[model samples]
Target: GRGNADATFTYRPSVPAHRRARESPLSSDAIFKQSHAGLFNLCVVVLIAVNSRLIIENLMKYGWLIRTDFWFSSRSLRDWPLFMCCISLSIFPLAAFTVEKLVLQKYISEPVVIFLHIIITMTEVLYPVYVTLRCDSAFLSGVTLMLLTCIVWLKLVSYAHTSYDIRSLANAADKANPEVSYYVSLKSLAYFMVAPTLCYQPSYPRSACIRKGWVARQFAKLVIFTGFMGFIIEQYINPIVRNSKHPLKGDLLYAIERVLKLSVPNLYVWLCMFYCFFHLWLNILAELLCFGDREFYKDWWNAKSVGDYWRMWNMPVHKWMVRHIYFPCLRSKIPKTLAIIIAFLVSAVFAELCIAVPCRLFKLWAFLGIMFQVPLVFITNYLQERFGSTVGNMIFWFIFCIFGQPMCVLLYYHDLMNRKG
Candidate 1:
């Protein structure tokens, strides 16, 4: 989420050959690279192997579940287009990453800088004017965008300070020939289209080096466990209450009910359930540790990506996305193409669990909106290729923003009236 900067060749560390020459007063870059580069690359290989194992496990156990859930929830029969879209979500991460690795390393500023400038400027100027003349409710969207943009800015600032060096890797890569340019181009499109969707925009800056290949395994296990806990509390509480004879001739709920019967008036185990419902415990831990310190900002807790409101709020999942999906795509075949789809699918399923299922308990239209993501991401990919990334972002965000509000209103209205309705 931090803006990339440029580093001159002299600024970059030397390759392994130069370290031995450092005794002759060769620059620090030469000294560090020659001595440490091999060790660094070795570490990367090990990390990749471990990371790949984690992903394979997920695919074996739960991948089928995701495909099944998608089929069951969606009313649209497995239309080839939509199914392809779902597949694309899984594949997008690979593609998007490959593209970025292959391209965008040049001036990270050119495409993204220009586009972001437009987004920021338009947000500040036109949004207020539109709100003044048009529907007042529209202002809420602008306000949210405003707050989010600032949050991202603060995060970027944090990223800069935590960074070990001021030199930007992308900038350094820029000096190379068309070969570098080719890779950089791929990167620009990939980053613009899919990277943001993979994780929450960070609240703080992180070092690219530190976060390069760690944390995903812990995050995935944590998320799955937390989600299971939420499910158990929701579904098994009543069974325990009624089946006192089955377990030690007693129900824990009764004991709890009896305690609540005394004066703590509103206290209840159900309250415990609420806390577990949005378990971002690991993310909080990461933030506390400043885990990404000199590398990546911890953004997974907010889950802010793909233009979803909940995404902006959750950051831990953002970390998982970056580590497991985004980074892997960079190293794999057809990175950008694979990255675009994978990012959305992974994000979509998580969002469905976090946002949709809970809402549907109250008969809200949760499935309709998020499920549309298959097609939405498809169109997003196509548009990104057809139009430049900047134009595509503008168009996609505008449409998505417009369509999403009603869903918010509906969910809010339900929760307000239900109070258990």
Candidate 2:
């Protein structure tokens, strides 16, 4: 017909094939290859070399094989709380499945199903706080946050299963497949409960097989980065923090100098963290399970704005917020601005809880820090429009990586000490 042909022609012209290809995205490795080898890339290479040199020098001086038994033993003992929390949180899913199966068998009313879901969701959300409080030490409290992260992760997966079942039942209620049968198996849930993703589906893209050699190499990188991070903290960061816990440490010039001095190590730590979690750990998990979607992160280093950097830095969390919070609020008749604000508020609250609970301070430093990004998003857009992406991107890295980090470290450190006193 005339309408069908015209629509096809119109859509084809509007969305060029190249643009659609770009939207599907590339793996991090491909992104780096596509990136221009400009001054920015050269600077990053130089910084990496300098930090590698620092690590080698420190290892030579202090010995790389220092006994870790004292640290590891204490950490292991202290982490039992987190282990118990995980066990407890794991029970909720099994219970939810059982209850959901019963409801389906009995043909429960829609309102009852909704009410049960709401109660379960509230419990999943509050259980993190309970786990955080149950921790016996500051270190344990910090570790428990990881458990909380996992719990929140599984909650999302559970919701995905629920949504899928609901939609399927609505579309085909007369079908022979039971709703419980459509639910993910406990074994699959167990694997996904630990998988390095926040979003969930019944099945994921998978490889033909696990590569043992590749897995071994990733494991080696994990250990190397762990040791490198420890070295940085011990050699570079310890002295600064130890000396800063005094009355005279609060001077503006002193603070600025300290921030500058700490910036290099802070950057090193940040980079190591990204490598450790987003690359090494995630890839290892993916390879072990033969999970094929290896694009856990984008080329965040090349981000042309603060907002872009936030989106690209942690794909899992960004996807979770968008899928669960952002779009849902929009669908529920919320204005776009209000939905964004609500998402930010949700993000800030969880972030602050994770930070503050471990530090034993409710100062909201992390929360306020995240809220500040809301404004920076607009400011970055303005700068990019006025000057260019290159200048704006440079400003973002300077302000966020070089300057903002040390300020945060100092602020939190100061707050911790003040509370201790």
Candidate 3:
């Protein structure tokens, strides 16, 4: 009875207050930690939710327009392979080099090896180009472009996974056994590229574990997620819309609108979205591989530090700013935050340049949108970190973007609303 009574007593921790606090088993998951990182990751997940809402809202509002869109009615499949071939070859160089910087280290800086790699990729791109040029069928050309679209999608997925791999390496390198090879570490990538070139720093948790080919595994996830999304956005949406009739069209205007609608959606999906996302992915991957994990995933995207956000999103253009604009300012001894503002402003100019071919009038608005975006984010991130406030930062990001930078919605909402091809 005595032993049973003693064991039945509630076992409150008897350690000193600090010791008890330290000994408490804290959940590694940020949902409750109330740390900046946990909050930032939460923000990322919320943004994803917001993006989904935007997509679904557009679908519901324009449900009727889908019936008459050509994407639903088109029978052309010939363009598939040609499109594949073009995008494949164009991305092949990046792919091969990705293998080198990520998978192997022996030939990373070999000029001749790099040259040969580009040549091979060019050959791949040329095949589809040649076939498309020689073909007489609009259907066949379309088929080629479609194939190119697949290639672009594949590469984009690859980039996302590869990006993840390198980051993990740097984060846990210390905990890893024998440490991961430079080729397998995202930290190494950041150190090599983002640090020296972009002046952006990393904040990934330092571990000692060797990250074995984690890239390959994340690559698989990237492929599945992006491929699924791409299928929905490109294939399903088009077919749904093409089958719907125009609510406003009744006569010659209807016929003209129908003709314009038939070809445009596919072109926009295949050429512009796929094209920009792919080439941009390639450029970012190349720079990332060369740089390691410095400039990217810093502020967001599982980054360990604030500056990483500025570096990770649209990396190449970000790198260009650090190299051309940020450094020159630093050399002239500009203030740090002011220099960041300048770099970000230069980044906006580059963003405008990147989209120049897409439009003229829209490009200006796009530039303004981007220019405001950088400082807006920099300040929001800076304030959140400085004040250690979650709700405030979230409110600022949401309110600022909604009111001051409503144009960002224009980037996504108008495109979805217009179903522009």
How do the predictions measure up, each by TM-score? 0.25, 0.78, 0.36
Candidate 2 structure quality by residue, lDDT tens digits, 1-421: 5564435534555665664444344655656567566969899999889878967875676564445662455556556666676666666666666555656565776567667766776777677667666655655446566556644644655455555566567657665654544445666666666676776665777788988998998899899889878877767776667667432455778777778778888898999988898889888888887888888889999988888898898787788778777777877888887776777887787777667777777787678888888888888989999999899889988988888878778888888788788
In terms of lDDT, the best-performing candidate is: 2
Clashing pairs in 2: none
Query: Stretches of candidate 2 above 4 Å error?
Result: 1-70, 73-77, 144-147, 150-154, 157-165, 168-176, 179-184, 245-249
**Full-model lDDT, candidate 1:** 0.41
- Which runs of model 1 end up more than 4 angstroms from their true locations? 1-346, 356-368, 415-421
Backbone collisions counted per model: 71, 0, 48
Candidate 2 vs candidate 3: which has greater lDDT?
2
lDDT of each: 0.41, 0.73, 0.47
lDDT of 1 by residue, 134-208 (tens): 332222233343333333333332232222122244346554333435554444433323223223232335433
Candidate maximizing TM-score: 2
Ranking by lDDT: 2, 3, 1
Candidate achieving higher TM-score, 1 or 2: 2
In angstroms, the error of model 3 at 175 is 43
7 Cα displacement, candidate 1 (Å) = 49
